[PDB]
Design a protein around this ligand. Structure first.
Ligand SMILES: [Mg+2]
Ligand SMILES: [Mg+2]
Ligand SMILES: [Mg+2]
Ligand SMILES: [Mg+2]
Ligand SMILES: [Mg+2]
Ligand SMILES: [Mg+2]
Ligand SMILES: [Mg+2]
Ligand SMILES: [Mg+2]
Ligand SMILES: [Mg+2]
Ligand SMILES: [Mg+2]
Ligand SMILES: [Mg+2]
Ligand SMILES: [Mg+2]
Ligand SMILES: [Mg+2]
Ligand SMILES: [Mg+2]
Ligand SMILES: [Mg+2]
Ligand SMILES: [Mg+2]
Lengths: 109, 142, 103, 54, 117
RNA sequence: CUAAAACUAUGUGCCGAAGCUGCGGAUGUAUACUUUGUAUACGUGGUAGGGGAGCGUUCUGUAAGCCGAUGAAGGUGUGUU
RNA sequence: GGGGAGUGAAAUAGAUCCUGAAACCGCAUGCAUACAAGCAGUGGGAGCACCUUUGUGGUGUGACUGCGUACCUUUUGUAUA
């Protein structure tokens, strides 16, 4: 049995978050929490939020023990972009997409 | 019924030693390549190496006819702007007899991974002695 | 027992109990056919070779049924010439099973 | 100045094969019991048997 | 009578892309590329139906050569001798006997030799 | 590659095409007898272009019929003609 | 933002809310892949993995190998740079 947590609509791109998600995939929950605690990346904060939520769901709704848990599944998907305009030189205009992601964590023994 | 291919796991390579003293180079090379490819076996399959091992001894006693000992040129290019390099047959035979058989035989084989794997079963030695006495080679009178 | 027979314009090397496909036949599914134009029989260091036929050799077989092979697709095309053409094909066969080889 | 052909999704992932992150050096300060970055003051001001800003 | 091209077009594209499984990149994903890939595959198959019969006869002739040269002849002389002895075994069966039964092939080579002399 | 694996002359074999033969199948035209069914024979590479025969799509009648919550259209796989 | 609880026939009917295709982007399993040169297929063909039967079966992958310079248009003529 895996317990899930979703963080939908993070204001970062999925390519930037997948780097942090690769660092904790398949590790024990305490070790992953340490890795996320001592990171200088911005995606580490959002991933730590989602992981903390998954541990709380596993222990409250399912009543599991925490030292036995693992980061069994984690993946990042793309969200919907925001379209903006950037004025360029000589009257030209560029299109800026501000990207979003969905983080999904699954914690299990 | 249908035509079966030879299984690489059932192939059995054998070991032979051939003496090169007083022999025309290309007329020996054709025999060596035919044995290396396996054309003499009824299980011959063009995509399988069903050939045999050959040991050449006295590689510095091989012969050429005509005036080729002085007139046959071997070329190389180092891939630098003027790096074409030239040598003789007779300078190369008293100094590196392995490369003469290497070139003569490798030119007579296919050109791809299986051809690279066939040329590995040829072992060329300048003198009368080889180290593969544990493999028990047969005297092939080519 | 390794005899050599002719059928459908081709030649086959058969043993007893073997099941094989040949070109379509007119015979009826469940009948029994006999090849009496035999080319060679080998029974173990005993080898009869026909010139062109072994005299008193028989090979009997049974007709299991008739069927079609899997679909082949024919495609003809001419580049830059506005010409394309396509076709399908399934070939008919008769399935025999070898019952006896006389020698 | 610019490409003549688009890049396949395989050659784009081959370039990113050096983009992975590594971990830091973390140790256990059994003077205090906590986890901290090696050679650094802890979150509350402890290092090798001394306390800053008591 | 307004006719919409939604279902039939989608089904045609789908059928073309189902015949391109295993191809690399856009050749199994993009309709424009996969369509040319399927047409070229059909052309190749039409030509290789003809080339298969040449390749297999070449293989039979090579195996018969290997078998005849162990029995003391070349391919040319064994085929000539068998034609002079009214033996009509074809090459597909001769290569089988060469690859699986050495005794019967020695019998055939002896028959050919006898025919030549 | 040198009494050739070159050149000239002669001979015996063999290899070699989607050519020809064998086996199975489809089709055009014309003929022969039933009187619409098969044989026989010749044919069946194609751009521009001419001729012939069809598939599928939306809508009207047939249709106040027939199928459908015991699951329609649509989407996604598999098998088969 | 989610996980339980609860409503409802239905909650991957939860408000960006019927159905939910494709391009595009992930995670998981199987096989292949770091001595080998080119329109990426096609004809062969070993091995491995999973289903199944007592297989001359099915599914996925594809070592090695013969052949092989995209499509449309316009041209006497195009892999055409
Ligand atoms: Mg301005
Ligand atoms: Mg990937
Ligand atoms: Mg001939
Ligand atoms: Mg032919
Ligand atoms: Mg013809
Ligand atoms: Mg015919
Ligand atoms: Mg025509
Ligand atoms: Mg014609
Ligand atoms: Mg649903
Ligand atoms: Mg919806
Ligand atoms: Mg390798
Ligand atoms: Mg390359
Ligand atoms: Mg022009
Ligand atoms: Mg011009
Ligand atoms: Mg051309
Ligand atoms: Mg170019």
């Amino acid at each position: 049995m895996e317990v899930t947590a979703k963080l939908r609509g993070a204001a970062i791109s999925a390519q930037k978050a997948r780097l942090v998600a690769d660092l904790i995939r398949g590790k024990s929950v305490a070790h992953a929490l340490n890795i996320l605690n001592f990171s200088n990346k911005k995606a580490a904060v959002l991933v730590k939020k989602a992981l903390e939520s998954a541990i709380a769901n596993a222990e409250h709704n399912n009543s599991l023990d925490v030292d036995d848990l693992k980061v069994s599944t984690i993946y990042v998907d793309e969200g919907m972009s925001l379209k903006r305009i950037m004025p360029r030189a000589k009257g030209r205009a560029d299109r800026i997409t501000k990207r979003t992601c969905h983080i999904t964590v699954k914690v299990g023994v | 019924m249908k035509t079966l291919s030879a299984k690489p796991a059932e192939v059995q390579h054998d070991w032979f030693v051939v003496d090169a003293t007083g022999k025309t180079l290309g007329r020996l090379a054709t025999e060596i390549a035919r044995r290396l490819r396996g054309k003499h076996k009824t299980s011959y399959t063009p995509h399988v190496d069903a050939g045999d091992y050959i040991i050449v001894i006295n590689a510095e006693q091989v012969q050429v006819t005509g005036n080729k000992a002085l007139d046959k040129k071997y070329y190389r290019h180092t891939e630098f702007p003027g790096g074409l390099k030239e040598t003789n047959f007779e300078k190369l035979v008293a100094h590196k007899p392995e490369e003469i058989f290497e070139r003569a035989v490798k030119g007579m084989l296919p050109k791809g991974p299986l051809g690279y794997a066939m040329i590995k079963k040829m072992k060329v030695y300048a003198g009368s002695e080889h180290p593969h006495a544990a493999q028990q080679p047969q005297v092939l009178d080519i | 027992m390794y005899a050599v027979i002719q059928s459908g314009g081709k030649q086959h090397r058969v043993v007893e109990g073997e099941t094989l496909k040949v070109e379509l036949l007119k015979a009826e599914s469940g009948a029994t056919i006999t090849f009496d134009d035999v080319l060679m029989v080998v029974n173990g260091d005993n080898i009869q070779i026909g010139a062109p036929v072994v005299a008193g050799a028989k090979v009997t077989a049974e007709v299991i049924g008739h069927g079609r092979h899997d679909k082949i697709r024919i495609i003809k095309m001419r580049r830059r010439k506005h010409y394309r053409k396509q076709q399908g094909h399934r070939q008919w066969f008769t399935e025999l099973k070898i019952t006896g080889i006389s020698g | 100045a610019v490409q003549q052909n688009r890049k396949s999704r395989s050659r784009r992932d081959m370039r990113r094969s050096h983009d992975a992150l590594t971990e830091n050096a973390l140790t256990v300060d059994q003077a205090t019991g906590e986890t901290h970055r090696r050679h650094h003051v802890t979150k509350d001001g402890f290092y090798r048997g001394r306390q800053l800003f008591a | 009578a307004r006719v919409k091209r939604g279902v039939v077009a989608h089904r045609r594209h789908k059928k073309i892309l189902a015949r391109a499984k295993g191809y690399y990149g856009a050749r199994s994903r993009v309709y424009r590329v996969a369509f040319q890939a399927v047409i070229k595959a059909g052309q190749y198959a039409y030509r290789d139906r003809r080339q298969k019969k040449r390749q297999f006869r070449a293989l039979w002739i090579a195996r018969i050569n290997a078998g005849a040269r162990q029995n003391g002849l070349s391919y040319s002389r064994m085929i000539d001798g068998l034609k002079k002895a009214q033996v009509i075994i074809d090459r597909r069966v001769l290569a089988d006997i060469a690859m699986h039964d050495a005794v019967a092939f020695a019998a055939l080579a002896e028959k050919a030799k006898g025919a030549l002399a």
